[PDB]
Amino acid sequence: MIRDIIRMGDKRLLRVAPQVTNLGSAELHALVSDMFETMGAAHGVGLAAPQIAVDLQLMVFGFEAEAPAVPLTALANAQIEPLSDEMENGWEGCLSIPGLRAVIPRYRYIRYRGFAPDGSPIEREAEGFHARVVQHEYDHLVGRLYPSRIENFDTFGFDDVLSYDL
Amino acid sequence: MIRDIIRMGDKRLLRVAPQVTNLGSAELHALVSDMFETMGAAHGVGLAAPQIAVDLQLMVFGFEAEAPAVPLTALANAQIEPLSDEMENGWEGCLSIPGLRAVIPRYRYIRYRGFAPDGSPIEREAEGFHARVVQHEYDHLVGRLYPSRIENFDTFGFDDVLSYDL
Ligand SMILES: CNS(=O)(=O)Cc1ccc(Cl)cc1
Ligand SMILES: CNS(=O)(=O)Cc1ccc(Cl)cc1
Ligand code: NA
Ligand code: NA
Ligand code: NA
Ligand code: NA
């Protein structure tokens, strides 16, 4: 089922979410299925559970169709560790902040760990857009959105209007 | 005539505007008239010329109808000076950033100086919302918008969704 995505300004996006403790359950697999459905109907590349007012350390992300393909992934209890100090700027937008985007610095190289909805462990090294998406969704699980990370406010604006060439 | 208001992301909002040098002219009085018309149709309380892609140190502002009434004013070549170090937080939104608002600290007490469209000097002390509006519009004449002034990102969100009690 498609769930409503709450927008920036909702206090429910500013919470620190507790862990998932029902790995392997029918209830988790249903929530994850709704998340993938929801993300797809909104044409997102990532969606975290707090964005559908579900207070849990859970996100879905990934796509074929521009950057290189990111595998379709549902990840509970995510933990992230940079694998280098190197930062890279790139464009970010967010389904909870419709119409806008900005340039945001992220770590270029990370590892992330957690669990798939069936309880099996996930751990991967990621770089570039893949790594960016996982950092951006992880921020939602700690009550953070991308505007508080903008450094260059010239790059923040409506998608149909911006002409900034990063 | 009503003019289009350009939105955040337009480079034309990020310019430093030159002075008005046609005080008393028919062309200035027509531009000012369009600005008041434009501001009123959008229900604004302030509008600066860069917001209608006119690169000039010129703003209009003011209203009867909530804060205390601010006199309807057209002000060219504005210069602002704080009259105290005291800052105050308050809600700001912007016609070039439709749908959003945030809490922004401004100087509580200022003087501002410049010229009315007929060339006569204007100088006034202002406080509270009056002072805030003039500082906010003045920022447009130096290529600045309110997001680069937010300190507490919990307060930034869509007007129909926020429940932050300042
Ligand atoms: C999940 N969000 S994100 O910032 O990491 C990926 C993204 C990048 C650019 C745009 Cl316009 C939208 C989303
Ligand atoms: C001209 N802009 S402003 O921030 O100074 C006045 C204002 C205050 C609150 C809202 Cl929601 C909109 C405008
Ligand atoms: Na928070
Ligand atoms: Na690690
Ligand atoms: Na600028
Ligand atoms: Na002064």
Task: Match 């429910």 to its residue by tokens.
Answer: A12
Longest C-alpha distance within chain B, in Å? 47
Domains, chain A, ranges and CATH? 1-166 (3.90.45.10)
Ligand nearest to the CA of A80: 4
Query: Phi and psi of B41, rounded to 5°?
Result: -65, -30
Element (H, E) at A135: helix A128-141
For B11, counting Cβ atoms within 10 Å of its Cβ (0-12 exposed, 13-18 middle, 19+ buried), the class is middle
B29 is in an annotated binding site: no
- Report which of B107, B104, B93, B92 is spatially closest to residue B151, judged by C-alpha positions: B104
| CA distances to A32, A114, A144, B129 from A19, in Å | 15, 11, 17, 44
Q: What is the resolution of this structure in A?
A: 2.0
Longest C-alpha distance within chain A, in Å? 47
Cα angle for residues B119, B37, B22 (degrees, 5° grid): 25
Q: Is the CB of residue A75 less than 8 Å from the CB of residue A58?
A: yes
Binding positions of A for Fe cation are 94, 136, 140
Element (H, E) at A138: helix A128-141
Enumerate residues 6+ apart whose C-beta is below 8 A from B139: B145, B146, B149
A158 and B7 within 8 Å at the Cβ level: the answer is: yes
Q: What is the C-alpha separation between A64 and B10, in angstroms, rounded?
A: 31
Q: What is the C-alpha separation between A58 and A146, in angstroms, rounded?
A: 18
Of B27, B86, B137, B151, catalytic = B137
Residue B133, both tokens: 């509006």
Q: What is the C-alpha separation between B81 and B77, in angstroms, rounded?
A: 14
Ion ligand 3 contact residues with beta carbon within 5 A? A 14, 143
- Report which of B81, B100, B101 is spatially closest to residue B92, judged by C-alpha positions: B101
- What is the three-state SS of chain B? CCCCCCCCCCHHHCCCCCCCCCCCCHHHHHHHHHHHHHHHHCCCCEEEHHHHCCCCCEEEEEECCCCCCEEEEEEEEEEEEECCCCEEEEEEEECCEEEEEEEEEEECEEEEEEECCCCCEEEEEEEHHHHHHHHHHHHHHCCCCHHHHCCCHHHCEECCCCCCCC
Q: What is the C-alpha separation between B49 and B27, in angstroms, rounded?
A: 14
Which residues are registered as beta bridge partners of A127?
A: A109
Residue A37 among the catalytic residues: no
Q: How many contacts does A have with B, using Cβ atoms within 8 A?
A: 55
Ligand 2 is surrounded, with C-beta below 6 A, by B 45-46, 91-94, 101, 132-133, 136-137
Residue B81, both tokens: 């000076």
Residue B161, both tokens: 């969704």
Length of chain A in terms of residues written: 166
Q: What is the C-alpha separation between B77 and B106, in angstroms, rounded?
A: 20
β-sheet with A97-107: strand ranges across: A87-94, A97-107, A157-158
Q: Separation of B165 CA from ligand 3 center, angstroms?
A: 15
Element (H, E) at A58: strand A58-63
